[PDB]
Design a binder for this molecule. Structure first.
Ligand SMILES: CCCOc1ccc(C[C@H](Cc2ccccc2)C(=O)O)cc1CNC(=O)c1ccc([C@]23C[C@H]4C[C@H](C[C@H](C4)C2)C3)cc1
Lengths: 256, 263
């Protein structure tokens, strides 16, 4: 039966490569040098990187924060497409699918964001740039503790040294989470996740024979993720309840 | 079912199960026996309202909510003591840096308390006073605005957690896994802790596979529940800040207060 598992794993990987442009393997090469990105480490760096480079993603801290949103909206579409390739997903009650993506994207966003971060910064805009971790903490208002929580998570998560083939199955497990509120038919979901969990388990055993109980440690990071999301939602509302320069075109705000 | 490695894991499971029974007076087996009525001597007095509560004082401050609340404070202080005792039995635990021992307990006792509290719960209520009493979920939710719902989140977790059908021998290892968490804030030497947890994780994994052959991916499902515990703790901690402000006259046990400080 270990046949259908290896196939599911290969399938998810191929699909993951297709849905996500910047893989971890590719991002890693750019972060260590073995392979250059424009560096944003201070205000003038920023102003220049967006001047020469047309970073598709008023006030700096605010403009940076909104670029994060723009990029997140973009990531949501990639994740949605990926999900549809997971065997059984499209066959679930349509409302449940929306529910699963609705509560799952944030967890996946931060999970994948770690692939693009090291302890010194994060790759932005397809990796054409590198925004410094220090510069992010240099932001005033509450925009200073905005990204820090993610870096800390990334340092820990990256310590597991997973690769794209590992992450592809993990993401699918995050998506098929049967405890999301509002699901109408939980069984099919948990049934698919169970199969995905089996696939992830064999994947990690064969890909990291020397890493003891890596499956357990990866599942434990689940705790870390939701805490990051919950905390994120809190700072997000604090930005809505306060801040008056967050004004965007009516059509734009609707887009988020 | 072979090698000396799997043999060491079974030995560890037995050691942990043996300590768990020795450290916790009210096991899940005894709790289930009382709840399911497979007795004529283990039947609890049920408290589902005020007069019941009143009549229970005889069978088993000044206010309904606060009295019930102070009771839970006392009981969990006692639980922390039992948990602390169980912790010393975990191989390697007492050999770790003394500060880390305190840190691990500080972050693990509540997650463990709610894990074990589920053993004493069903969709309708919870056992109290070593199983002599039973307070229904509805009575506890009818309480005054503040306390009126400090328990509901525990019930919601319990009915789902109990769905895994774990038994004491399973819980003994899981409780151990929880305590030996290398990602606790402020830990000095994270390596020795992770090494102990890895071995506990192996013990738990084998135990579940052997105890629940037909329960597919129980191990992973059990681990995912850990996120549920953290959440319970945060909510509870926030509900306490609310109470200590609305009820300026209600005291909170020092031990429990030192555990929430800078949590
Ligand atoms: C009432 C059911 C509640 O049963 C709970 C609920 C939550 C906890 C966890 C605590 C709550 C807390 C939250 C905030 C701070 C600290 C801890 C925690 O998280 O630390 C423990 C118990 C276990 N409780 C019992 O077994 C139990 C035994 C005796 C009584 C009486 C108290 C008093 C009135 C009645 C008659 C006498 C005198 C006995 C009932 C009540 C409860």
């Amino acid at each position: 039966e270990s046949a259908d598992l290896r196939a599911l794993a290969k399938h998810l990987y191929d699909s993951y490569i297709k849905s996500f442009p910047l893989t971890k393997a590719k991002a890693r090469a750019i972060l260590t040098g073995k392979t250059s990105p424009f560096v944003i480490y201070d205000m003038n760096s920023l102003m220049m990187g967006e001047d020469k480079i047309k970073f598709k993603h008023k006030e700096v801290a605010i403009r940076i924060f909104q670029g994060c949103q723009f990029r997140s909206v973009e990531a949501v579409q990639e994740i949605t497409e990926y999900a549809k390739s997971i065997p059984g997903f499209v066959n679930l009650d349509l409302n449940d699918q929306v529910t699963l993506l609705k509560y799952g994207v944030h967890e996946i966003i931060y999970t994948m964001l770690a692939s693009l971060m090291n302890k010194d910064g994060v790759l932005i805009s397809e990796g054409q740039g590198f925004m410094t971790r220090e510069f992010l903490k240099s932001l005033r208002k509450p925009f200073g503790d905005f990204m820090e929580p993610k870096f800390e998570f990334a340092v820990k998560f990256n310590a597991l040294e997973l690769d794209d083939s590992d992450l592809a199955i993990f993401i699918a497990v995050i998506i098929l989470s049967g405890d999301r509120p509002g699901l109408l038919n939980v069984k099919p979901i948990e049934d698919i996740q169970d199969n995905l969990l089996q696939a992830l388990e064999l994947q990690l055993k064969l890909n990291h024979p020397e890493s003891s109980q890596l499956f357990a440690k990866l599942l434990q990071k689940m705790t870390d993720l939701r805490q990051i999301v919950t905390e994120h939602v809190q700072l997000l509302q604090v930005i809505k309840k306060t801040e008056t320069d967050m004004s965007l075109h009516p059509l734009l705000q609707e887009i988020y």
